[PDB]
Design a protein around this ligand. Structure first.
Ligand SMILES: *[C@@H]1O[C@H](CO)[C@@H](O[C@@H]2O[C@H](CO)[C@@H](O[C@@H]3O[C@H](CO[C@@H]4O[C@H](CO)[C@@H](O)[C@H](O)[C@@H]4O)[C@@H](O)[C@H](O[C@H]4O[C@H](CO)[C@@H](O)[C@H](O)[C@@H]4O)[C@@H]3O)[C@H](O)[C@H]2NC(C)=O)[C@H](O)[C@H]1NC(C)=O
Ligand SMILES: *[C@@H]1O[C@H](CO)[C@@H](O[C@@H]2O[C@H](CO)[C@@H](O[C@@H]3O[C@H](CO)[C@@H](O)[C@H](O)[C@@H]3O)[C@H](O)[C@H]2NC(C)=O)[C@H](O)[C@H]1NC(C)=O
Ligand SMILES: *[C@@H]1O[C@H](CO)[C@@H](O)[C@H](O)[C@@H]1O
Ligand SMILES: *[C@@H]1O[C@H](CO)[C@@H](O)[C@H](O)[C@@H]1O
Ligand SMILES: *[C@@H]1O[C@H](CO)[C@@H](O)[C@H](O)[C@@H]1O
Ligand SMILES: *[C@H]1O[C@H](CO)[C@@H](O)[C@H](O)[C@@H]1O
Ligand SMILES: *[C@H]1O[C@H](CO)[C@@H](O)[C@H](O)[C@@H]1O
Ligand SMILES: *[C@H]1O[C@H](CO)[C@@H](O)[C@H](O)[C@@H]1O
Ligand SMILES: *[C@H]1O[C@H](CO)[C@@H](O)[C@H](O)[C@@H]1O
Ligand SMILES: *[C@H]1O[C@H](CO)[C@@H](O)[C@H](O)[C@@H]1O
Ligand SMILES: *[C@H]1O[C@H](CO)[C@@H](O)[C@H](O)[C@@H]1O
Ligand SMILES: *[C@H]1O[C@H](CO)[C@@H](O)[C@H](O)[C@@H]1O
Ligand SMILES: *[C@H]1O[C@H](CO)[C@@H](O)[C@H](O)[C@@H]1O
Ligand SMILES: *[C@H]1O[C@H](CO)[C@@H](O)[C@H](O)[C@@H]1O
Ligand SMILES: *[C@H]1O[C@H](CO)[C@@H](O)[C@H](O)[C@@H]1O
Ligand SMILES: *[C@H]1O[C@H](CO)[C@@H](O)[C@H](O)[C@@H]1O
Ligand SMILES: *[C@H]1O[C@H](CO)[C@@H](O)[C@H](O)[C@@H]1O
Ligand SMILES: *[C@H]1O[C@H](CO)[C@@H](O)[C@H](O)[C@@H]1O
Ligand SMILES: *[C@H]1O[C@H](CO)[C@@H](O)[C@H](O)[C@@H]1O
Ligand SMILES: *[C@H]1O[C@H](CO)[C@@H](O)[C@H](O)[C@H]1O
Length: 422
């Protein structure tokens, strides 16, 4: 949950009035051929303190990556489309050590076409599209990120930020994270993600993060981690998350390590067609083990989950696997009604976890244990609707991905918090 106000300190109109650096004035050519990188860099240099970097409608080729740093009361208005032509590694666009910042499109049509499929068709990965590091008092909204060669959007140690009204659509494989975030006091809402890895995921250290109205439309799903040594994650809320045809509805992953994860609320989730549903995994096999007794998870509430999973017999819809040497404590599982899409039974798995709900123990002696429960009849009230835009098929790995429009519907029965800019 947020600890204070988020977003830029001054409006884009105020910054624009101070000074507008139109990239066409810094050598940019909207010919979908001439490298726009240098122009953005020169425009930033002139407008990074109090001004606004403006990218008018048109098609631009990005051949060399840009690293924009040291801004103060600045903004970038992306009203055109950037196409990746560069082949270097790294981040196509990186904004670092900047305060009072806004990255947006006034038309709700600004986009970055990463052409990640060129790499994926060959079994490889390329640059990430966007990375914000140590950015404070900011907002990123009304933009579209498509087919990143690797990650789409990472917020590395940022704070007092708001991210919303975005569509992120990437390839159908792991390694193509949607939004990865760590820092403090960040509000993410009204975002749709397609890929086969992180939907909106929190990493350590992080405190006071609110994530809601998220539409994981064929994705890896939301998660927390991987968590390792010296973990410190606290006051995290995810609510009103709709997940379709994904790896999971929510996963907390660690494998050894230390530190603590506390005060997490995951409520109002709906899922259909996923591999896993609730998957707390303290022995996540996809990551090499970290020295320590295990990250201590405490006071985690999972409430009001409904829907169906592809196969609840092979993948327990309720899977709570904690460290035997660092038992989960104070977990509250309440009103989780998930049923299986094939078969007539499903399993609930609990390992060394304490609290109240389903297979959890409410004991005093937090010793380890392993238990499996077979449910032979559909939990009452598992029925939940679907979203009209649920993908019938994903975008593969060998053909370009068409640029989507930003939707105005993310979770059943709710409307977006903020109207689209255009
Ligand atoms: C901005 O600039 C970017 C480049 O950075 C443009 O992206 C390229 O767009 C063009 C289309 O305008 C793409 O080329 C066409 O791709 C077609 C599909 O790809 C092929 O698929 C077949 C079958 O799977 C394979 O055999 C090929 O190996 C390719 O993978 C392709 O079929 C087509 O080929 C035919 O092109 C012309 C006209 O169709 C024929 O005359 C020619 O003989 C050939 O047979 C094109 O090559 C190109 O792939 C895109 N680049 C990338 C990286 O995706 C944007 O389109 C530009 N945007 C704007 C708005 O201008
Ligand atoms: C376990 O974790 C939960 C969060 O996951 C903690 O809940 C939070 O507890 C506080 C106090 O009970 C709730 O009250 C809030 O207080 C502030 C300031 O007074 C006020 O601004 C809010 O309007 C609200 O009243 C807070 O809302 C609640 N968080 C959520 C998301 O509901 C809980 O305290 C932890 N329990 C233990 C034993 O540590
Ligand atoms: C259950 O017992 C211990 C924990 O209590 C596990 O380590 C073991 O794998 C079994 O499933
Ligand atoms: C629950 O049962 C499953 C098999 O159905 C085991 O894999 C697990 O360790 C626990 O005993
Ligand atoms: C499956 O259905 C009933 C529902 O009451 C279960 O309680 C029982 O275990 C059976 O095998
Ligand atoms: C760990 O071991 C103790 C004693 O066997 C139990 O009381 C507890 O429920 C858990 O199985
Ligand atoms: C879980 O782990 C404890 C020790 O950490 C054992 O006592 C128990 O038998 C199970 O393996
Ligand atoms: C999980 O389920 C098994 C069998 O129902 C129990 O024996 C165990 O104590 C835990 O409740
Ligand atoms: C298997 O056991 C769990 C508790 O261990 C029940 O919640 C479930 O209904 C099934 O009987
Ligand atoms: C459910 O519980 C056990 C867990 O060991 C399953 O293996 C069995 O099929 C039962 O129905
Ligand atoms: C069956 O029972 C559940 C609570 O366990 C309700 O949520 C549902 O509406 C139905 O009455
Ligand atoms: C699932 O059900 C809801 C109402 O419960 C509809 O609004 C939706 O279109 C879908 O049919
Ligand atoms: C079960 O009930 C829900 C809402 O009550 C529907 O949306 C779903 O399609 C199914 O009929
Ligand atoms: C999800 O699926 C239901 C039917 O199962 C539709 O009513 C809804 O529009 C969406 O396609
Ligand atoms: C690209 O990947 C292969 C061809 O390399 C196709 O099977 C797939 O449908 C996509 O067009
Ligand atoms: C992927 O990208 C290429 C180039 O923009 C298009 O030709 C194709 O239709 C898809 O949008
Ligand atoms: C936003 O706009 C869409 C159409 O793009 C509507 O379907 C939705 O209800 C919301 O008004
Ligand atoms: C988003 O908006 C659509 C209408 O376009 C609803 O059907 C959905 O439940 C959510 O409110
Ligand atoms: C998105 O923006 C609107 C105003 O346009 C706010 O009211 C909302 O809280 C969110 O910041
Ligand atoms: C974006 O807007 C189009 C219509 O303009 C709609 O078809 C899409 O579903 C939405 O994401």
């Amino acid at each position: 949950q947020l600890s204070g106000s988020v977003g830029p300190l001054t409006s884009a109109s105020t910054k624009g009035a101070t000074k507008t650096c139109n990239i066409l004035s810094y050598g940019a050519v909207a010919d979908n051929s001439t490298d726009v990188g240098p122009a953005i860099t020169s425009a930033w240099a002139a407008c990074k303190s109090g001004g606004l970097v403006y990218i008018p409608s048109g098609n631009y080729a990005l051949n060399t990556w840009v690293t924009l740093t040291g801004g103060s009361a600045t903004a970038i208005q992306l009203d055109g489309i950037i196409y990746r032509t560069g082949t270097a590694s790294g981040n196509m666009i990186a904004v670092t050590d900047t305060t009072d910042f806004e990255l947006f499109s006034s038309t709700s049509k600004g986009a970055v076409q990463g052409f990640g499929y060129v790499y994926h068709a060959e079994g490889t990965y390329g640059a990430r599209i966007l990375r914000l590091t140590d950015v404070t008092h900011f907002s990123v909204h009304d933009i579209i990120l498509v087919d990143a060669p690797a990650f789409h959007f990472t917020m590395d140690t940022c704070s007092d930020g708001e991210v919303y009204n975005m569509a992120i659509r990437g390839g159908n494989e792991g390694g193509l994270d949607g939004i990865d975030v760590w820092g403090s006091n960040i509000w993410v809402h009204d975002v749709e993600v397609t890929n086969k890895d992180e939907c909106v995921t929190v990493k350590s250290p992080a405190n006071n993060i609110l994530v809601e109205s998220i539409y994981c439309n064929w994705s890896g799903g939301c998660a927390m981690g991987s968590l390792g040594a010296d973990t410190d994650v606290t006051d995290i809320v995810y609510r009103n998350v709709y997940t379709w045809s994904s790896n999971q509805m929510y996963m907390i992953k660690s494998n050894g390590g230390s530190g603590t994860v506390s005060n997490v609320l995951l409520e109002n989730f709906i899922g259909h067609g996923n591999a896993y549903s609730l998957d707390i995994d303290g022995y996540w096999s996809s990551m090499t083990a970290v020295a320590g007794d295990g990250v201590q998870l405490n006071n985690i509430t999972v409430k009001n989950w409904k829907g169906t999973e592809a196969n609840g017999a092979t993948r327990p819809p309720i899977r709570v696997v904690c460290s035997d040497t660092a038992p989960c404590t104070d977990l509250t599982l309440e009103d989780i009604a998930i049923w299986t899409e094939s078969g007539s039974s499903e399993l609930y798995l609990c390992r060394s976890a304490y609290g109240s709900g389903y297979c959890l123990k409410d004991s005093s002696s937090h010793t380890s244990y392993t238990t499996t429960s077979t449910v032979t009849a559909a939990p009452s009230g598992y029925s939940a609707t679907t979203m009209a835009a649920d993908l019938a098929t994903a975008f593969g790995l060998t053909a370009s991905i068409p640029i989507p429009t930003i939707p105005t519907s993310f979770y059943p029965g709710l409307t977006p918090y903020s109207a689209l800019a255009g």
